[PDB]
Swiss-Prot record:
The gene is RBP7. This is Retinoid-binding protein 7. It comes from the Eukaryota. Keywords: Cytoplasm, Retinol-binding, Transport, Vitamin A. It is found in: Cytoplasm. Forms a beta-barrel structure that accommodates hydrophobic ligands in its interior. One of its GO terms (cellular component) is cytosol.
């Protein structure tokens, strides 16, 4: 495990297009999503997390405990229901989103004080990094 907590500003984003294409996000929505740079806010208390992804268009969040399965309806994204599980892979916080799409999930980790995120679906990986701000 690692302390991922903080308020995080998006600093780099690679292949968000491919990730969104894998989810079937429509053309107009992909355009808007790429221009945004939502802030990530991670609240971490033991095994309990709330991860906020906040933009002017919509603040949203996911709340979970490590090791505790939870459904996600994904109303703000692709509207596909997944059964999600978050566990530690050494110091990488890893989510498996079980559902229609194959190999769907995300991973967070921290390098020094720089937050990393991979979001992936169908072999498309979006890599993002953030600075504490």
């Amino acid at each position: 495990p690692a302390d991922l907590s903080g308020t995080w500003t998006l600093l780099s984003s690679d292949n968000f297009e491919g990730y969104m294409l894998a989810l079937g996000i429509d053309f107009a929505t992909r355009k808007i999503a790429k221009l945004l740079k939502p802030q990530k806010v991670i609240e971490q208390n033991g095994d309990s997390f709330t991860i906020h992804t906040n933009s002017s268009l919509r603040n949203y969040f996911v709340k979970f405990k490590v090791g505790e399965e939870f459904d996600e309806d994904n109303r703000g994204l692709d509207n596909r229901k997944c059964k999600s599980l978050v566990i530690w892979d050494n110091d990488r916080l890893t989510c498996i989103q079980k559902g229609e799409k194959k190999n769907r999930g995300w991973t967070h980790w921290i390098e020094g004080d720089k937050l990393h995120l991979e979001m992936f679906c169908e072999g498309q990986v979006c890599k993002q990094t953030f600075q504490r701000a």
